[PDB]
Design a binder for these strands. Structure first.
Ligand SMILES: O=c1ccc2ccc(F)c3c2n1C[C@H]3CN1CCC(NCc2cc3c(nn2)OCCO3)CC1
Ligand SMILES: [Cl-]
Ligand SMILES: [Mn+2]
Ligand SMILES: [Mn+2]
Ligand SMILES: [Mn+2]
Lengths: 192, 483, 481, 189
DNA sequence: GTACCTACGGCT
DNA sequence: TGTGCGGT
DNA sequence: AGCCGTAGGTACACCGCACA
C-alpha cells in the first residue's frame, strides 16, 4: 500500500501493524513507533460497513484493499493464516465515540472476511488515553509511551468465544435491518 | 486488561456510538428545537456579543471560537450548520444573518468561511433571551475548561417553527417547519385548555408552512402526522399555465417544494424529455432572478394540452414531492416519537419553567440588592463614624470586623461599604439610594405575587408569547388546498 | 471607460509585484519577519497565549489571526505557524506546538482541528515591550483593528532563524545562525562602528543550522557575509563503521538543512536500483525518537566504503549547497545586504526600541506620580476632602470644588473621587506612600538613561547579554577547514 | 463549470470570468441569466508566456475558456464564431486579483489577439472594500458591477502592438532581470 | 484555491 | 527539471 | 436511486525565483 509505513523486520512473528484513522494520527504514530517491528497503516475515515455492502463494492474500496494487501493473508475462502505479514493487527482508532464506531466497522470486516485472523489471537485493540480528540493531538513520545511501547502499553487481545452469538451480534448491530438495531438500543440504553 | 470478547466489544462500542449520536448529535431537543452543533453556534454568537446591532464578524473566527470552546468536531460540520441557519430557503425563521455567498436553491454551497461574515438575527435574541437569569441549566463543556447551556430559553416554539431533519442510529427524524403566528396561537389555546384535542389545535395550526411556500394537497397527511407523529404530506410546486404568443402556451413554476434542489429538478425534467418519457415539451429554462424571484418555464407544443403535461410532470419529477413526517425529538434526554399536542405541551412546560426560574432569579437578585442598599443607607447616615472606623483599622479584615459589629452589618454589607468610592458621598446620592430602595421593595412584591399564583405566572407566559407573536409572526406562505 | 492594454499590464503587474515584495514574501531586517508570521505572533500575544498558559487549539488561533490581521487563506496561516514550531526548521522555534507538527520526512502537520499551540519562551523576547510605544502600530486591513508594523525583537531574529522567500523580480535565502555568536557580534559592533566583516567573523563563524551537519570550508561563508551572496557547501554527518563478519556500513546521523530525509533515501534507493552506484547491499532508516536520526547504508564485503560515501555525496542530497542571497526590507524597500549591514540595522532598531520604551516609562511614571500626589493630598486632608464632597450636589460640582480648594488637576480630582473607602485603612495609606517613593526613584533612573547616550547604549548591551545568557546555546553545525 | 445565458445571440451576450466558486455563487445569483454567462476559474491561471504549448492546450482552465468563447485559438481563431461580444474579467479587487488579470490578458493577447482588437475584452470594476467577491451579497454585486445601468466596465484597447509585445515579454516572460529592472525603475515605496 | 469517499434511516 | 514557502 | 444533514477522513493545481 502507498499509505503503508512498513517496519524493517520481515519476520511476521515479531511485527505489528497499527491501523489508525488517517494521516493526522499517522504522523504522530510514525514518529513515535519502533520502525523495526511496527508498521502503520493510516485509514481514510469511516470504514465501509461490509455487513451492508455487496462484494463488488467491498473489493473496490481503497481502504479495504490496503488492509488486504498489507496483511497478505488473502480473504474469505482463500484466507491463508500462514501468509500473515504481522502477528499483531492493532486497531488504534481515536479516543472518541466515532473511533469506537470505526472499531466496530473494522471488527465487522475482520470477522466476515478474515475470521481465522481473530481465532488465532492476531487482532488487538490499542488503548490510547482519553482526553485527546485524536492521536494527532498527542505528541509522538506520549503516543509511544502510553499506547505503543510494549513495556508499558495495555493491548486488548480480541477473543471469539461463541461464533453463533457473534454471527447474530454482527447481523443485528451492523446489518441492514433497522428495527433490530433500534430494539437493541432501546433494551440497552441507560440514559444516565 | 489483557483480553476482550468480540461480542462484548461490539455491543458496548456500538451502543456507545448509537446513544451519543441519538442524544448528542442528530436529534433536536423538544424544548428549544436544537441539536448540539446549532446550540453551540448560537451560544458562541451570544458569548462573543455578535448581536444584530453589531457589525458582521468573520465566519472563520466564529467557527474557530465554537470549535475550541464547545464543539470538538470538524470545522466543516460547524460552518455548514451555520450556513443553513442563514438560508431563507432552508429555515422558516432564519437564526443567522449572513453576509456574502451563503449558497443557493440550486445546491451551490456557501463561499469558503474565509470570505463570509455572520451575526445573529433578531429572532435569535428570543432563543437566547433570559439565558443569564438562571433559567436553564449550564453544564461543563467537553474538556472542563468552559460552561455551555444544556438548552436555550427558546422564547418562541422553535422545534416546530423551523422543523428538523436528522439521520441518527436506529431511528431518524423529519419535522416540517410551521407558521409562527399559528404556532403561538396554538400554544395560547393549549394554555387555556389542557384537554384541547388535535382537531381543535388544527383550528390554529393549519399544517406545515415551508420557507419555500408552494402548496400542500389535502389535510389527510397533515391530520395523521399531527395525531400520531407520522404521516405523508404531498407538496406541490406553484405552477400556472399561460400564453406565450402565436397560440402557444407555457407552464410557469414560481415556487417549488421544500428541500428540492431547483437545478436538479430541472435536469430531471430535461432527462425525461431527452429519453422521451414525457410528451409535449419544446423548451425548458430557468428564468429565476433576484428581481423576479423563482421562475422556471416549460414551453408546451402548439395544440398539446398543457394541463396533461403539468400533471405528468407532477407524477414523474420532484415538481411534486412528499414530506414524510416522522416527529422524533429528545424528551427528558431520550428520543421519543411525539404528536403535535405532546410537542406543544413540552414546549409550554419549558416556558413555564423558564419564566418561573427567571422570576425566582430576579427575586434573589432584588433581595440581595435591597440588603446592600440597607448597608449603604446606614453607612451614609453615619458616614463620619464609618470613615473613622476605617481609618483607625490597619487592615480591611479589621475594618470589616469593626463595621459589622459596630453597625450591625453583614459581611456583604461591610464589603460593599469598603468598596464604595468617595463620589458616592455627594449630596443627592443618599436620595438616589432611597429611591432605588423603595422601587426595589415594590419590585420584590410584584415578583412574589407571580411566584405565589400559578395563574399569574401562566398569564405572564401568555403575554410574553403574544408580544413575540405580534413582533415576529408573519403570513402563511404555503397554501393548503382541499384536496 | 477604455483601458490601454499596456498601461493596464504595467500598473496591475507593478501593483502585484510591489505588494509581494513589501508585504508578503520578504522579511523585515529589524525583526526578521514577514507579515503572516508577525501577525501570528502578535495574535498569540493579544490572546495571552504565553508559555505559562495551557495550549490553545490551532483552529482558534488561526481564526483570530484571519479575522483581525491577515486577509488570506487559513492554510497559509496554519502552515506558517506549523513551521515556526518545527525544531528541524527553526533554529530557535517561535511556536510551542502540541500534537503532530510534521516531520523531516515531509509528512505534514495534523489538521488544525487537532493541534494546539502557544508561544515559546524565546518568542516573549520578540514581543517584549511591544505595549510600551516601542514600535509604530498601523491600521489593519479593514480599519477595525491595529497591528504592529514591526516587533521589538529583543534578539537578532532575521539572522538567528534565517528566511527564505520567492517574490517577484527577486527572492531571498538567509541561513540561520547561532544566537550566542550573533549577540557577541552585535556586542562587538556596538563598541566599534567601524568593525570589519572579518572582525565580526571572529564572533559569527558562519551559519548554524537546526539540523546540525557540516559546512565545507569558509570561502562561501566569507563571500556571503561580504557581499550578501555566496554558495555554502553542506554535508551530512556520516561515519564508516564495522558491522560484523568483516563488513562495514555508512551511518548518517545528521542531514543537510531543508533536505527531506525520506526523499534523500529514495534517491539512494533509485541509484542502487538503476545500478548507477555500486557497493550498497542495504538501506534502512533507523531513525527513532530515542536514537535520533540514523540512516544506515550497508556496504558489500571488501568494497571501499569511503569511495561509496564520496559517490553518495556527488550524486545525492547527502551533500547539498545553500545559495545565500540576503535580501530583506530595509526602510520598507528590498535590499541585498551584507553581514555588517544586517547587524547595523538590527542594532539601530534596538537603540530606538530601548529609547522609546524609556521615554514611554517616564511619561507613565510621571503621570502616575501626579495621580499619587493627588491621593497623598487627599489623605493629608481627609476630613476636608470628605466635607467638600458631601456639600456637593453632583460629581461635576465635587470635581470643581476639589480642584479649587486643593489646587488639584482634573485628573487628580477624578482619582480622589474614584478612590474606594478601603484605601483609607492603615495598610492602604502606606501602599500609596510606598508606591510614590519607589516611583520617584524609578523616574530618576529613567532620566539618567535619557540624559546620556552611552548609558542607553550600555543598557542595550546589558539586555542583549542577559538574553544571550538565558537563550544562547551551543553551535550545532561544524564548519570544517 | 460554465453557467451559460439563455440567449444564443452573441451580440447581446456577456461572459463574466470570476475568481473561484466562492465568487461564482454570488455572481450566478445576481446576474441577468438571459444575457450573462459565468465561468468560475480556479485560482492563478497558467502564465502562457512561460509555458510550453503542449502544457497550455492541456490546461483545464485554458480549455474551458476556449470552449466557452467558441472562437478557437492562434491561426484558427475565427472572430465570427465568438459566442459573446463581451468577455468580462471580474477578479477580486486586490493584488492577487490584479495578478490574475495580467495572466488572463497574457493568454488573450498571445492566443486570441483579434478578440482584444475587436473590443470584446472588458475589465469589471467591483468595489474595493471586499478582499474577495464571495464576501459580497448577490444584489450588491449586480448593482455595483454587473448591471448595465450602473456598472463601469473598462474596454481593453490595443494602441501599439510593438510596445504591447515588449510589455508582455518583459512582465510575463522568463527573464527575471528585466522584470526586476522594471520594478526598480517604477516602484514608488 | 477546490471535490470526494465513508455511516446512518427512510422513502540543482 | 524538482523543491524551498506565502499566495489563489 | 440518491437525497437529506452531522459526522470520520483527506489530494491535487496554479504563480514567483534560484539553486543543483
Ligand atoms: O484533504 C483534502 C483532499 C482533497 C481535497 C480536494 C478539494 C478540497 F477543497 C479539499 C480537499 N482536501 C481538503 C479540502 C480543502 N480544505 C482546505 C482548508 C479548509 N479549511 C477552512 C477553514 C477552517 C477554519 C478556519 N478557516 N478556514 O478558521 C478557523 C476554524 O477552522 C477546508 C477545505
Ligand atoms: Cl389547459
Ligand atoms: Mn478521528
Ligand atoms: Mn497639606
Ligand atoms: Mn482576494
Amino acid at each position: 500500500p502507498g499509505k503503508l509505513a512498513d517496519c524493517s523486520s520481515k519476520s511476521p512473528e515479531e511485527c505489528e501493524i497499527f491501523l489508525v484513522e488517517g494521516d493526522s494520527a499517522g504522523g504522530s504514530t510514525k514518529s513515535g513507533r519502533d520502525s523495526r517491528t511496527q508498521a502503520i497503516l493510516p485509514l481514510r475515515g469511516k470504514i465501509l460497513n461490509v455487513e451492508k455492502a455487496r462484494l463488488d463494492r467491498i473489493l473496490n474500496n481503497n481502504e479495504i484493499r490496503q488492509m488486504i494487501t498489507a496483511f497478505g493473508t488473502g480473504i474469505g475462502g482463500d484466507f491463508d493464516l500462514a501468509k500473515a505479514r504481522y502477528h499483531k493487527i492493532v486497531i488504534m482508532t481515536d479516543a472518541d465515540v466515532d473511533g469506537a464506531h470505526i472499531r466496530t466497522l473494522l471488527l465487522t470486516f475482520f470477522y466476515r472476511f478474515m475470521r481465522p485472523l481473530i481465532e488465532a489471537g492476531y487482532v488487538y485493540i490499542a488503548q490510547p488515553p482519553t482526553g485527546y480528540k485524536g492521536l494527532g493531538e498527542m505528541n509522538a513520545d506520549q503516543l509511544w509511551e502510553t499506547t505503543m511501547n510494549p513495556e508499558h502499553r495495555a493491548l486488548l487481545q480480541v477473543k471469539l468465544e461463541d461464533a453463533i452469538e457473534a454471527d447474530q451480534t454482527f447481523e443485528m448491530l451492523m446489518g441492514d435491518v433497522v428495527e433490530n438495531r433500534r430494539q437493541f438500543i432501546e433494551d440497552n440504553a441507560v440514559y444516565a | 486488561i489483557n483480553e476482550r470478547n468480540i461480542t462484548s466489544e461490539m455491543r458496548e462500542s456500538f451502543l456507545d456510538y448509537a446513544m451519543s449520536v441519538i442524544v448528542a448529535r442528530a436529534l433536536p431537543d423538544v424544548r428549544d428545537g436544537l441539536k448540539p452543533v446549532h446550540r453551540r453556534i448560537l451560544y458562541g454568537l451570544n458569548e462573543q456579543g455578535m448581536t444584530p446591532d453589531k457589525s458582521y464578524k468573520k465566519s472563520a473566527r466564529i467557527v474557530g471560537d465554537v470549535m475550541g470552546k464547545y464543539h470538538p468536531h470538524g470545522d466543516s460540520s460547524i460552518y455548514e450548520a451555520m450556513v443553513r441557519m442563514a438560508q431563507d430557503f432552508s429555515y422558516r425563521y432564519p437564526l443567522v444573518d449572513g453576509q456574502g455567498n451563503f449558497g443557493s436553491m440550486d445546491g451551490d454551497g456557501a463561499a469558503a468561511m474565509r470570505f463570509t461574515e455572520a451575526r445573529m438575527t433578531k429572532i435569535t435574541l428570543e432563543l437566547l433571551r433570559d439565558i443569564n437569569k438562571d433559567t436553564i441549566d449550564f453544564i461543563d463543556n467537553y474538556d472542563g475548561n468552559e460552561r455551555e447551556p444544556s438548552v436555550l430559553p427558546a422564547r418562541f416554539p422553535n422545534l416546530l417553527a423551523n422543523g428538523a431533519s436528522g439521520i441518527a442510529v436506529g431511528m431518524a427524524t423529519n419535522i416540517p417547519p410551521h407558521n409562527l403566528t399559528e404556532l403561538i396561537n396554538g400554544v395560547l389555546s393549549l394554555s387555556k385548555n389542557p384537554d384541547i384535542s388535535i382537531a381543535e389545535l388544527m383550528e390554529d395550526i393549519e399544517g406545515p408552512d415551508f420557507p419555500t411556500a408552494g402548496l400542500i394537497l389535502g389535510k389527510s397527511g397533515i391530520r395523521r402526522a399531527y395525531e400520531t407523529g407520522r404521516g405523508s404530506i404531498q407538496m406541490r410546486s406553484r405552477a400556472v399555465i399561460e400564453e406565450r404568443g402565436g397560440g402557444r402556451q407555457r407552464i410557469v413554476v414560481t415556487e417549488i417544494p421544500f428541500q428540492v434542489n431547483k437545478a436538479r429538478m430541472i435536469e430531471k425534467i430535461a432527462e425525461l424529455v431527452r429519453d422521451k418519457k414525457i410528451d409535449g415539451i419544446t423548451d425548458l429554462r430557468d428564468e429565476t432572478s433576484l428581481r423576479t424571484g423563482v421562475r422556471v418555464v416549460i414551453d408546451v407544443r402548439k395544440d398539446a394540452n398543457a394541463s396533461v403535461i403539468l400533471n405528468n410532470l407532477y407524477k414523474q419529477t420532484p415538481l411534486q414531492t412528499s414530506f414524510g413526517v416522522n416527529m422524533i425529538a429528545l424528551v427528558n434526554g431520550r428520543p421519543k416519537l411525539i404528536n403535535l399536542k405532546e410537542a406543544l405541551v413540552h414546549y409550554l412546560e419549558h416556558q413555564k419553567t423558564v419564566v418561573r426560574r427567571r422570576t425566582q432569579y430576579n427575586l434573589r437578585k432584588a433581595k440581595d440588592r435591597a440588603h446592600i442598599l440597607e448597608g449603604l443607607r446606614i453607612a451614609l447616615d453615619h458616614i463620619d463614624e464609618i470613615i473613622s472606623t476605617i481609618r483607625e483599622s490597619d487592615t480591611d479584615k479589621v475594618a470589616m470586623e469593626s463595621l459589622q459589629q459596630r453597625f450591625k452589618l453583614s459581611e456583604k454589607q461591610a464589603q460593599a461599604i469598603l468598596d464604595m468610592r468617595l463620589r458616592r458621598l455627594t449630596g443627592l446620592e443618599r436620595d438616589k439610594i432611597e429611591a432605588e430602595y423603595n422601587e426595589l421593595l415594590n419590585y420584590i412584591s410584584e415578583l412574589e405575587t407571580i411566584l405565589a399564583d400559578e395563574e399569574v405566572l401562566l398569564q405572564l407566559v401568555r403575554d410574553e408569547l403574544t408580544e413575540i407573536r405580534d413582533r415576529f409572526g408573519d403570513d402563511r406562505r404555503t397554501e393548503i388546498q382541499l384536496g
